[PDB]
């Protein structure tokens, strides 16, 4: 996930099982003040939902990751 | 060829999981559960099956609501709140 953050400008989140891509994009935008280009989702075998959120070029996922506080 | 050669053909399913009781007794083609009788409104039970009744009866689960009724009855189904009378 951190390789994705550094290279592909993609933030990886664990999200609610009940949340769809619209809600994921809206929540990420509201919570982190960044523009979202696309959201890809999957359901992990452990029963949880994982989201790959690709931001637009205006924003740096590495900087936002440092601001959140995981690096 | 009723043993292993035919056992080589065991891949289909007569019963899947039942939504109501979760027992994997829902007959696919008959659309009915052989254990709880779903989707009939009543639950399937028989006086010749006393052990089965005992397996599925009240008190074998959480009793999420029914287990507080005795305390509520003992206090008389009171409403309101306890006052801070002293200490």
């Amino acid at each position: 996930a951190m390789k994705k953050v550094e290279d592909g400008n993609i933030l990886v989140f664990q999200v609610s099982m009940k949340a769809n891509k619209y809600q994921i994009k809206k929540a990420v935008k509201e919570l982190y003040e960044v523009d979202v280009l696309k959201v890809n989702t999957l359901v992990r075998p452990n029963g949880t939902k994982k989201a790959y959120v690709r931001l637009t070029a205006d924003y740096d996922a590495l900087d936002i990751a440092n601001r959140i506080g995981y690096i | 060829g009723k043993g292993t050669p035919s056992f080589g053909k065991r891949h289909n399913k007569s019963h899947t999981l039942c939504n109501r009781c979760g027992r994997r007794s829902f007959h696919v083609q008959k659309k009915t559960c052989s254990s709880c009788g779903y989707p009939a409104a009543k639950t399937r039970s028989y006086n010749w099956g006393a052990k089965a009744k005992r397996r599925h009866t009240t008190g074998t689960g959480r009793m999420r609501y029914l287990k507080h009724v005795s305390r509520r009855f003992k206090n008389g189904f009171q409403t309101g709140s306890a006052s801070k009378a002293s200490a």
């Binding site: 919570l31 959140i68 506080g69 995981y70 | 009724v69 189904f77 409403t79």
Partner: protein, 119 residues
């Protein structure tokens, strides 16, 4: 630590909403920190504070609805008393106490008397 209900009940709705938002932000930051720090017990206190704030907010709103409906014949079912299904289906004291005019006259004229056996 944690928030105290007798201190939350003083605040207005807006103050409680703001404090709930602050608590949720704090919980998100602590969930981030837990990924690194192997033990983080402040998570539990923050979760319980969130629960207490939500409880106080709900109490205020329900009490406002109750005062809005005070004295009305029809109340919201969640504001009505629960009791038991059979207890709610039973006759009230008034209905159970209704007697006919003939029986009331007989009861007035010939009540059960208080007597004793001495003389």
């Amino acid at each position: 630590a944690g928030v105290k209900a007798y201190e939350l009940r003083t605040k207005s709705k807006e103050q409680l909403a703001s404090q709930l938002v602050d608590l949720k932000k704090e919980l998100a930051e602590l969930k981030v920190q837990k990924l690194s720090r192997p033990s983080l017990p402040k998570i539990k206190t923050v979760r319980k504070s969130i629960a207490c704030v939500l409880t106080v907010i709900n109490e205020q709103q329900r009490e406002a609805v109750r005062q809005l409906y005070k004295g009305k014949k029809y109340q919201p079912k969640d504001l009505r008393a629960k009791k038991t299904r059979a207890l709610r289906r039973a006759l009230t004291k008034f209905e159970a106490s209704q007697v006919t005019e003939k029986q009331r006259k007989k009861q007035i004229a010939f009540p059960q008397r208080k007597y004793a056996i001495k003389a």
